[PDB]
C-alpha cells in the first residue's frame, strides 16, 4: 500500500473534472485548479446548481462561470465524475 | 500544472466584477477591492439582494452602495460574472 | 492596484453614515465611530430596526439612540449608504 | 478623527443607564458597573424582560434586581437609553 | 468609578441567594457557593425548574436539592433576587 | 467564606448518589466514580432514562447498567439526590 | 476512594460488550477494542441501529458488522450492558 | 489485551471495502485508499447514495465514481461491509 495523504491523492485531480458537494447537499461541477490545506478550492468552467422556489415548486437550474473560489469549510465531498441491460 | 494557492488565484479578480454567495444563498455583486486570509471581503459598486415579505409574497430587490465589507465566515462562493431584456 | 486590507478600507468610513446587517438580517444605521480587529463596532446617531409581533402581523419599527456598541461576531455586512425613468 | 477602541468608548458608559440586547432579542436595562474583554457584563438596578406564555397569549413583564451578570457571548448590542404615560 | 472585574463583582454574591438562567431560559435558584473562571457554578439549597409535557399542557414544577454543580458554558445570567399602588 | 473551586466541591460527591441532566433534559442517576476537567463523568449503578415513541405516546423507562461514561460537553447539571409509593 | 481518571475506568471495558449512544440518541452495541483521548472508538461484533421511514412509519432495524470506527466527537455515552415480581 | 489506537486499527482497512456514514445518515461505500488525523478520507470505486424528491416521493439512488474525498468532520462511522436478489 502507498503512503499518500488524502490531500496528496487530491493532487491527482488537478486540471480534471471534479464534482463538489457542500453543506446541505449543494453541488458544483468544474475543473480543479487549486486547493489549499483548509480545503479552499478553485474551479474553472464551473457549473453551480441553483435551487429555486415559486409556490411549492422547488425547481432547480445551472449557473455557468469561468472561475469559482469555494470557501473551504463548506466543502463536504470532492468526487471524480460519475453499459448493458441483462 | 501551475502552483497557485486558492487565494493566489483570487488576486486575479482584484478590480474585476465578482459575484458573492453567502450562508443560505444571499447574493451580492460588486468590484473586488480587498480581501484577507479569513476571507473578509470588500466590494465597491455593490448590489446587495434584498429579500422581502408581504403576506406570502416573498418578492426580492436591489440595494446599491458605494462600498460593502462582507465578514469572511459568511462567504461560501466568490465567482466571476456569468443585465437587461432589449 | 492598491494594497489596502479590508480593515484598512473600513477606516475610510470613520465618521461616515454606515449600514450594518447582523446575523439573521437585523439592521442598524449610524455614524461609524470605532471598530477593532474582532470587528466590534460603535455607531453614534444609531437607528436600530425593531421587529414586532402581534398575531401574525410581523410589523417593524425604529429605535433611535446616541451610541451603540455592536458585538463583533454578529456583524455580517457593513455597507456605505445606498435618477431618470426611460 | 479620534483613536478609541470600541471597548474604550464602552468605558464612557460606566455608571450610566445602558440597554442590552441578547441572542434572540431578549432585553435588559441597568447601570453599567463592569465589563471585561469577552464582554461579560454587570449591571446594577437592572430590569430584565420576562416573556410568558399562557395559551397563545405571549404576554411580557419586568423582573427587577439589584445586580445582574450577563455572560459575554450572549450579548449582541449595548446601547445608551432611547417610562410613563402621564 | 471602582476598577472591579465582572468576576470580582460576582464574589460579592458568595453565600447570597442568586438566580441563574441557562441556555433557552431554564432557571435555578440557590445560594452561591463557588464559581471559577469558566463560570462553572455550585449552588446550595437549590431549586431547579422542571418543565413538563402532558398533551399540550406544558406545565412547570420545582426540584429541590442540597447542591448543584452547573456547567459553565450553559450559564447566561446570574442575578441577585428580585410597595404602594397609586 | 471558604475557597473551594466548583470542581473541588464536586469531589465531595465522589462515591455518593448523583443525578445528572444532559443537553435537552435527558437524565441519569448513579454513583459518582470519576470526573475530569472537561467534565467527562463516570457513574456506577447507573439508571439511564429512555424515552420512547409509539404513535403520539411518548412514554418513558429505565435502563440499568453497571457503569456509564458521560461525555463532558453534554453535561449541564450534576445534583445531589432530591423511589416507591407504599 | 481510588484516583482513576474517566479514561482510566474506560480501560476496564476493553474487550467487554459496550453500548454506545451518539448525538441525537443513535445507538451501537459491540466489543470495545480501542479508544483514544478524543474518544474515537473501535468496536468489533458491532450492531448499529438503523432508523427507517416509509410514510409516517418510523420503523427501526439492526446492521451487523465485523468492526466499526466511531468518530470521537459524536459519542455521548458509553455504558456497560444492561429477577422477581412481588 | 493489544495496544492499538483507533487510527491504528483503521489502517487494517486500507485497500478493503468500507462503508461510511456521514452527518444525518448519508452513506458511501468504497475502497479505503487514504485517511489522515482529522479523519478526511479517500475511497476509490465509491458508490455515493443520492436522495431525491419528487412530490412526497423521497426515492433514492446510486452515483458511482472513481475516487471520493470525504471531509473529515462530516464522518460519523466507518464500518467494514455487512448486492443482488437471485
From Swiss-Prot, chains A, B, C, D, E, F, G, H:
Supply the Gene3D superfamilies for this chain: 2.30.30.100
Q: Which Pfam families match?
A: LSM
One cellular-component annotation, GO = nucleolus
| Keywords, ordered alphabetically | Cytoplasm, mRNA processing, mRNA splicing, Nucleus, Ribonucleoprotein, RNA-binding, rRNA processing, Spliceosome, tRNA processing
Q: What InterPro entries does the record tag this protein with?
A: Lsm3 (IPR034105), LSM_dom_sf (IPR010920), Sm (IPR047575), Sm-like_LSM3 (IPR040002), Sm_dom_euk/arc (IPR001163)
GO process terms (BP): deadenylation-dependent decapping of nuclear-transcribed mRNA; mRNA splicing, via spliceosome; P-body assembly; rRNA processing; tRNA processing
| Record's subcellular location | Nucleus; Nucleus, Nucleolus; Cytoplasm
According to the UniProt entry, its GO molecular function terms are: RNA binding
Q: What is its main location?
A: nucleus
Span of domain Sm: 5-82
Q: Which residues form the signal peptide?
A: none
List other remarks: Present with 7060 molecules/cell in log phase SD medium.
Assembly: Component of the heptameric LSM1-LSM7 complex that forms a seven-membered ring structure with a donut shape. The LSm subunits are arranged in the order LSM1, LSM2, LSM3, LSM6, LSM5, LSM7 and LSM4. Except for LSM1, where a C-terminal helix crosses the ring structure to form additional interactions with LSM3 and LSM6, each subunit interacts only with its two neighboring subunits. The LSM1-LSM7 complex interacts with PAT1; within the complex PAT1 has direct interactions with LSM2 and LSM3. The LSM1-LSM7 complex interacts with XRN1.
- PANTHER family assigned to the protein according to its UniProt record, in alphabetical order: U6 SNRNA-ASSOCIATED SM-LIKE PROTEIN LSM3 (PTHR13110)
Family in the record: Belongs to the snRNP Sm proteins family.
Any idea what job this protein has? Answer: Component of LSm protein complexes, which are involved in RNA processing and may function in a chaperone-like manner. Component of the cytoplasmic LSM1-LSM7 complex which is involved in mRNA degradation by activating the decapping step. Together with PAT1, the LSM1-LSM7 complex binds to osmotic stress-activated mRNAs to attenuate the osmotic stress response, probably by limiting ribosome access to the mRNA and consequently translation. Component of the nuclear LSM2-LSM8 complex, which is involved in spliceosome assembly.
Protein name (database record): LSM complex subunit LSM3
- Its source organism is Saccharomyces cerevisiae (strain ATCC 204508 / S288c) (Baker's yeast)
Q: List the lineage, top down.
A: Eukaryota, Fungi, Dikarya, Ascomycota, Saccharomycotina
Amino acid at each position: 500500500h502507498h503512503m499518500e495523504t488524502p490531500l496528496d491523492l487530491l493532487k491527482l485531480n488537478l486540471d480534471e473534472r471534479v464534482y463538489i458537494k457542500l453543506r446541505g447537499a449543494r453541488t458544483l461541477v468544474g475543473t480543479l485548479q487549486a486547493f489549499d490545506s483548509h480545503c479552499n478550492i478553485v474551479l474553472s468552467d464551473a457549473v453551480e446548481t441553483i435551487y429555486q422556489l415559486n409556490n411549492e415548486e422547488l425547481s432547480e437550474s445551472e449557473r455557468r462561470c469561468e472561475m469559482v473560489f469555494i470557501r473551504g469549510d463548506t466543502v463536504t465531498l470532492i468526487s471524480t465524475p460519475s453499459a448493458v441491460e441483462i
